[PDB]
């Protein structure tokens, strides 16, 4: 308890965010801790089977493309001689067609068989306090207007840092640590293009994310002792997962971040926020976890504005995947098992990650 925040006088320490240590070490620590938390859970090599899928019991409209498929297939029992014909529900982002008739297979069977996370373990972040070993010290820059590089005139030594929640979010970093008075932008070189601009603002904007179906999980026994948690029936209506952000608070925080970002590009410049340019689905869209389920929520409803030199809510839709490929390794997955009931999580967006456009041609 009571970690000794010890102030020092007359000290000018040269901090650097971008060539820092403690971040590649933290990244290797969190991916190795991810790897060690999957070894005792089961392996899903007997599931790469030719699935026969169909459409879910639903009024199929042609414009709305259904994110659920109803797939039935053979699977071994714990008795090796016998097999059972079982059925489950999958998302369309997890199966692929094999070529009339329709036959599907999983998305990863020609790359890597992979592991269902055994659901006694959970995925919410708990705070980790990093500590220095004996014979080392940890310095903390207590300055307020500190953009992240150079001298800091008020440092303080700490034995063990404060609560760091490891969240995995791609854009719109959630549950972060707020600023003190302003909204702070920071960059390694702001006149560069390839370096992201990290934005952290003072008062958070809360975000309410949900999926409103109640999945009923079922246990399909693969073999002796190994069970596979599939999606059974959807009772009630099927709907799309979404997230809500307060419109007035989002417009106010974008006004604050424009008022801050005009200090680096002249005051008479027209700042225009556009949506993401393209790429894989884990970067074009806001990816996060919520109660042990992985959301991929569209983001074009927020980053769409044009700012000139002078109780409603934004609903943004989501798609959810069961097979992840986090950290982008070569032979890994994680089959996240489904969660019973509807899912709701409330969090507080504290920051953003932006990227300029590499403009030529007289651009104002």
């Amino acid at each position, epitope marked *: 308890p009571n970690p000794q925040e010890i102030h020092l006088e007359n000290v000018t320490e040269e901090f650097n965010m971008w060539k820092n240590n403690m971040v590649e070490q933290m990244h290797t620590d969190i991916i190795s801790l991810w790897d060690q938390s999957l070894k005792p859970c089961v392996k899903l090599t007997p599931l790469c089977v030719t699935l026969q899928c169909t459409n879910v*019991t639903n009024n199929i409209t042609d414009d709305m493309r259904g994110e659920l498929k109803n797939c039935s297939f053979n699977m071994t029992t714990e008795l090796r001689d016998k097999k059972q014909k079982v059925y489950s529900l999958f998302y369309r982002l997890d199966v692929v067609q094999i070529n009339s008739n329709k036959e599907y297979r999983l998305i990863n069977c020609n790359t890597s068989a992979c592991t269902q996370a055994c659901p006694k373990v959970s995925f919410e972040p708990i705070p980790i306090h990093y500590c220095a070993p004996a014979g080392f010290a940890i310095l903390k820059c207590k300055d307020k207007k500190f953009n992240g590089t150079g001298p800091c005139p008020s440092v303080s030594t700490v034995q063990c840092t404060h609560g760091i929640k490891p969240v995995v979010s791609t854009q719109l970093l959630l549950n972060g640590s707020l600023a003190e008075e302003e909204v702070m932008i920071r960059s390694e070189n702001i006149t560069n293009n390839a370096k992201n601009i990290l934005v952290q603002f003072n008062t958070p904007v809360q975000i309410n994310c949900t999926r409103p179906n109640n999945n009923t999980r079922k246990s399909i026994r693969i073999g002796p002792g190994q069970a596979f948690y599939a999606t059974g029936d959807i009772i009630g209506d099927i709907r*799309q997962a979404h997230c809500n952000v307060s419109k007035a608070t989002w417009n106010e925080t974008l006004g604050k971040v424009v008022k801050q970002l005009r200090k680096h590009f002249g005051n008479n410049t027209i700042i225009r926020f556009a949506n993401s340019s393209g790429g894989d689905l884990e970067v074009t869209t806001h990816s996060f976890n919520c109660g042990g389920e992985f959301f991929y929520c569209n983001t074009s409803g927020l980053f769409n504005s044009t700012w000139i030199s002078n109780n409603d809510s934004i609903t943004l839709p989501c798609r959810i995947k069961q097979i992840i490929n986090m950290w982008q390794r070569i032979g890994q997955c994680m089959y996240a098992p489904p969660i019973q009931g509807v899912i709701r999580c409330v969090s507080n967006i504290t920051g953003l990650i932006l990227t300029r456009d590499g403009g030529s041609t007289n651009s104002t």
Partner: antibody, heavy 132, light 105 residues
Framework: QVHLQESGPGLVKPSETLSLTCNVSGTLVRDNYWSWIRQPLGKQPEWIGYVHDSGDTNYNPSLKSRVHLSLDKSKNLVSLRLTGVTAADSAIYYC??????????????????????????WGKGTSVTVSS | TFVSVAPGQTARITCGEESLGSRSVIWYQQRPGQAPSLIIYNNNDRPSGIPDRFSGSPGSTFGTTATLTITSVEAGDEADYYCHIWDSRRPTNWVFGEGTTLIVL
């Protein structure tokens, strides 16, 4: 005050196009949606279709080609044209008004709702039958 | 599918397949010989001219048959009833529910 008047042949020979008209009272035809209701003897009635101006003329997909509905702006009527009289359509017929209404069960912008109908007032029916 | 209760008592006349999603049923009456007549045009509200004693089950319950509850039955209720159901998962029904009539003593 509304009351409707169905009018048709009643006795139809097979392989002929059945036609039927519906005279109106009280209000005219254009300002609301109209519907045709079939009922064979001693069972559930089935709904044939519903009409309105500006393309709101969906039919029973079981029939979908064997029947064409139409409007009478000039005489203030609404008509039915059936094609290929079988033995099954020997039934009582009804022209009847209908009112729409939206059942909303989710996010409104995600097209997560539907439109249910209901026939409020009815005519008297016409027992059309086929003979040989 | 006939049901007969003594006059003055209550009756629960049921119709339709089990519920899958949210639904907005409607309920129709057919006195013998004449045209039909609307009774309930949503789950649980009725048009004017149609009296009370015509209560219905709500639509929000999942996995539940479409029923119609009458109290204080009389001789005017001797007619045919019909459900016409609009499930938000199964497609639209161009034919009514099964004819389940009701006679009184």
């Amino acid at each position: 005050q509304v009351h409707l008047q169905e009018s048709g042949p009643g006795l139809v020979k097979p392989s002929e196009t059945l036609s039927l008209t519906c005279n109106v009272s009280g209000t005219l035809v254009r300002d609301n949606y109209w519907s045709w209701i079939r009922q064979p003897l001693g069972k559930q009635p089935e709904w044939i279709g519903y009409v309105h101006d500006s393309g709101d003329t969906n039919y029973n997909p079981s029939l979908k080609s064997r029947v064409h509905l139409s409007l009478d702006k000039s005489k203030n009527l609404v008509s039915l044209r059936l094609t290929g009289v079988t033995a099954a359509d020997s039934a009582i017929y009804y022209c009847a008004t209908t009112k729409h209404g939206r059942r909303i069960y989710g996010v409104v912008a995600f097209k997560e709702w539907f439109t249910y109908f209901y026939m409020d007032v009815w005519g008297k029916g016409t027992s059309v039958t086929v003979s040989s | 599918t006939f049901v007969s209760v003594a006059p003055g008592q209550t009756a629960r006349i049921t119709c339709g397949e089990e519920s899958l999603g949210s639904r907005s049923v409607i309920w129709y009456q057919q006195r013998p010989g004449q045209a039909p007549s609307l009774i309930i045009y949503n789950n649980n509200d009725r048009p004017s001219g149609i009296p009370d004693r015509f209560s219905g089950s709500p639509g929000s319950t999942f996995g539940t048959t479409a029923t119609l509850t009458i109290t204080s039955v009389e001789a005017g209720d001797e007619a045919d009833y019909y459900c016409h159901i609009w499930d938000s998962r199964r497609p639209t029904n161009w034919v009514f529910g099964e004819g389940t009539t009701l006679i009184v003593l």
